[PDB]
């Protein structure tokens with residue numbers, strides 16, 4: 001079997017969907033090939049919070065922002081190693097990208113909630129309904145079906161097809177044990193995500209991130225797009241810069257979105273029954289703090305009063321069930337029971353929470369200077385979750401220009417080849433800020449589909 | 455020539471002076487040997503700001519603090535690698551150390567000023583009169599003369615004397631081209647400071663910090679105390695952790711205390727005439743930001759209105775004269791002249807300052823979110839200073855216990871040998887917080903003199 005389309009997109013995450021919808025809208029034929037049996041990749045299981053300076057939600061909330069500040073925040077976050085034009089183009093197109101999600105894809109965002117990720121000077125992360133990428137990918141899928149964008153699941157790209165001029169003119173893919181050739185008349189878009197779930201690639205570029213660490217990502221995040229492009233002499237950069245997320249499942253590696261309760265008053269408790277870091281510190285600080293605790297894990301503890309504001313249990317019931325079945329999470333009536341289930345010294349936990357309750361009442365955390373104010377934890381019920389850092393995002397990847405054209409080892413455009421999303425390596429410097437992956441994948445996914453369609 | 459004292463102290467910085475005064479006060483004979491022609495080492499040229507949780511000045515200013523928070527701040531600052539008992543003993547003795555400086559040494563601190571160094575959750579750095587160590591070392595010197603503590607300048611310790619039991623029983627030193635033997639009946643205190651000015655030792659332990667970087671320290675900061683103790687099998691740790699200070703002379707390496715005006719409204723301007731980092735960001739962030747600018751330097755720009763509050767020109771007139779003579783600093787009437795003297799694009803500088811003036815008026819810095827509020831810079835005169843990062847403090851050094859006893863490679867006490875101050879390597883982890891060196895050198899200097907005298 002062979003197929004022919006104008007634009008062949010590899011991957012059904014936010015970057016690939018954005019490229020596909022733009023290619024179809026330009027009047028071209030397009031397909032997305034997806035190696036998993038389900039669509040959406042890490043974009044699906046993402047929190048999908050998306051930074052935008054100058055959003056309609058900021059206006060609703062009375063929050064002032066500027067592109068200049070979003071750019072400076074972002075460049076600083078990556079230790080000033082990100083490509084300034086890549087960051088500028090991301091920020092310059094972020095409002096349009098989010099309004100396009102709202103108006104064209106019909107993604108629903110909360111009109112009056114924003115998150116301020118570490119490193120951002122103001123609250124600027126839009127929040128999709130449900131606080132996950134489920135809303136985003138489901139709406140993308142509906143819109144793709146409406147406009148006539150086919151998605152071929154269980155179809156694994158294995159090789160880029162390069163003609164004698166050096167132009168990329170298609171993709172060889174595996175489906176049901178056979179090779180299928182996808183001819184691409186105008187362009188191939190690599191939108192395959194990162195390599196957080198490729199242990200050998202992690203160890204090659206960052207030996208510390210070995211089998212001691214899980215991955216927050218899906219099993220398909222294995223760097224295939226980098227490997228396939230390097231075979232035809234695409235350049236890569238920043239491959240060793242790989243970030244972790246602090247509060248993840250010790251068993252599966254999955255992120256614990258349910259533990260976003262720490263932004264609403266949950267406390268981090270070590271095996272000794274003691275707090276050990278400000279719960280609102282930067283994520284890398286929290287990760288290092290946890291790895292310095294006994295056993296290299298923490299507990300996250302909160303009560304019904306916090307859930308009634310935060311809703312992270314209601315919003316992440318699959319995590320609740322999975323973590324509970326894995327023995328990583330308990331719902332308990334009393335702090336004494338919270339200590340018992342995890343062999344935490346009872347007297348120390350009770351003393352810690354007595355202090356927390358006093359700090360909540362005064363607004364002054366005399367142990368760690370909690371920046372927003374603690375919440376009284378004297379009454380339950382309680383959730384207590386065991387968590388540890390897990391590998392989360394690969395900042396490195398393919399070298400592209402701001403038009404998403406992939407460049408070779410001499411900086412020359414590889415004709416017919418584009419790349420967008422976590423597979424690229426020039427936006428985030430040494431360290432991506434929270435909420436900036438979604439901005440990157442939508443902005444550059446759209447550009448890639450536009451450029452491939454030309 | 456030979457001398458005999460109960461306690462022989464090597465170095466006349468804050469650690470050595472503290473040890474000497476305690477030894478004399480215990481009723482023992484003591485001497486300080488100092489290799490330079492002047493006393494005070496880096497403690498002399500320090501800002502000498504000293505962190506204390508629970509000081510009389512905090513009480514005057516209505517500021518609440520706690521030892522728990524000072525400990526947690528400190529441990530976090532060094533990436534959780536500092537020795538917890540060393541940090542606890544430092545914090546537990548900080549109030550007593552500062553009250554001892556005030557009441558016994560007669561150091562004058564401002565009663566109503568404190569500095570909040572990066573990483574500290576509350577304002578807690580006491581400020582000596584004059585905003586330098588000159589006050590501290592001059593008062594130490596007077597007190598030493600009053601109590602009968604001799605200081606032998608131009609006397610360089612070269613070898614520790616070890617008897618057949620393994621006990622350290624003296625020091626061989628060079629003076630006027632001859633070797634002088636100092637017999638120590640009860641103890642030798644190594645208080646020799648750090649190795650920021652030893653290029654070969656820097657390169658050995660941190661190859662990046664080579665000849666591209668100057669040193670903020672005096673010429674005597676060469677690691678001699680580490681070398682002399684390792685010869686008799688003292689252990690060392692954390693030697694590769696070496697911190698820089700962001701705003702220093704590109705010619706001499708000296709710190710620019712005069713540029714503490716950035717805590718009162720001065721702006722950082724690159725060669726392009728643009729701001730590029732929040733001026734109140736963490737020092738390591740500022741250092742990296744500067745090294746990312748054209749030429750790897752910044753300018754620091756402020757006006758008379760800022761000086762009338764900050765006083766950093768009045769307090770650091772020697773810097774003013776030296777930097778000006780070196781072509782690194784100008785006093786100018788207009789922003790146009792500030793641009794001219796350093797070949798900064800005039801239009802860009804004027805546009806940058808127009809923005810600053812608007813941000814000062816509104817309190818909202820739309821470019822970098824200055825956390826305290828900018829100050830109008832429309833009227834002069836102005837100072838503009840060229841600055842770059844310089845090597846500043848060596849966190850590593852000798853292994854001691856909390857009694858300042860030096861330990862060998864098997865963790866065993868070396869009898870008769872003590873060490874205190876920047877020469878030790880267990881307090882600050884990977885990164886010392888501002889103001890914490892002075893706390894360390896006084897607390898542990900006092901302990902070392904007390905323990906050596908026993």
Ligand SMILES: Cc1cc2nc3c(=O)[nH]c(=O)nc-3n(C[C@H](O)[C@H](O)[C@H](O)COP(=O)(O)OP(=O)(O)OC[C@H]3O[C@@H](n4cnc5c(N)ncnc54)[C@H](O)[C@@H]3O)c2cc1C
Nearest residue numbers: 011013015035041042043047157193220421422435437438
């Ligand atoms: C749990 C989690 C939470 C996150 N939360 C946030 C957040 O709130 N905000 C934020 O900004 N970022 C967040 N991130 C990061 C962000 O979600 C991702 O970086 C981003 O979604 C990646 O999008 P993408 O389109 O590049 O790739 P993906 O979404 O990973 O999609 C790539 C797709 O390509 C497919 N593919 C790969 N190789 C092949 C091949 N050979 N053939 C065919 N198909 C292939 C994969 O199967 C996958 O479906 C989160 C990440 C995770 C894991």
Ligand SMILES: Cc1cc2nc3c(=O)[nH]c(=O)nc-3n(C[C@H](O)[C@H](O)[C@H](O)COP(=O)(O)OP(=O)(O)OC[C@H]3O[C@@H](n4cnc5c(N)ncnc54)[C@H](O)[C@@H]3O)c2cc1C
Nearest residue numbers: 465467469489495496497501611647674875876889891892
């Ligand atoms: C410019 C500057 C500003 C600073 N500002 C601050 C600040 O505000 N707050 C803060 O907390 N920290 C600050 N620091 C750091 C702090 O001042 C130092 O870490 C601290 O003063 C070191 O004290 P010390 O007693 O260990 O050593 P030093 O003060 O360096 O004294 C050691 C002495 O031993 C002598 N010596 C060395 N080898 C020999 C030998 N072989 N024989 C004899 N004598 C020898 C040296 O000549 C020197 O005089 C600053 C540092 C500098 C350089």
Ligand SMILES: O=C(O)/C=C/c1c[nH]cn1
Nearest residue numbers: 047049260433434435436
């Ligand atoms: O890594 C990110 O950008 C966001 C992670 C996250 C956590 N909770 C919601 N999103």
Ligand SMILES: O=C(O)/C=C/c1c[nH]cn1
Nearest residue numbers: 501503714887888889890
């Ligand atoms: O490095 C420190 O602890 C302090 C440096 C400084 C700058 N200005 C006054 N002190």
Ligand SMILES: [Cl-]
Nearest residue numbers: 065066067068
């Ligand atoms: Cl703007």
Ligand SMILES: [Cl-]
Nearest residue numbers: 236237238239
């Ligand atoms: Cl690289």
Ligand SMILES: [Cl-]
Nearest residue numbers: 519520521522
């Ligand atoms: Cl206290």
Ligand SMILES: [Cl-]
Nearest residue numbers: 690691692693
């Ligand atoms: Cl070490």
Ligand code: NA
Nearest residue numbers: 394395396422
């Ligand atoms: Na990447």
Ligand code: NA
Nearest residue numbers: 848849850876
């Ligand atoms: Na040290």
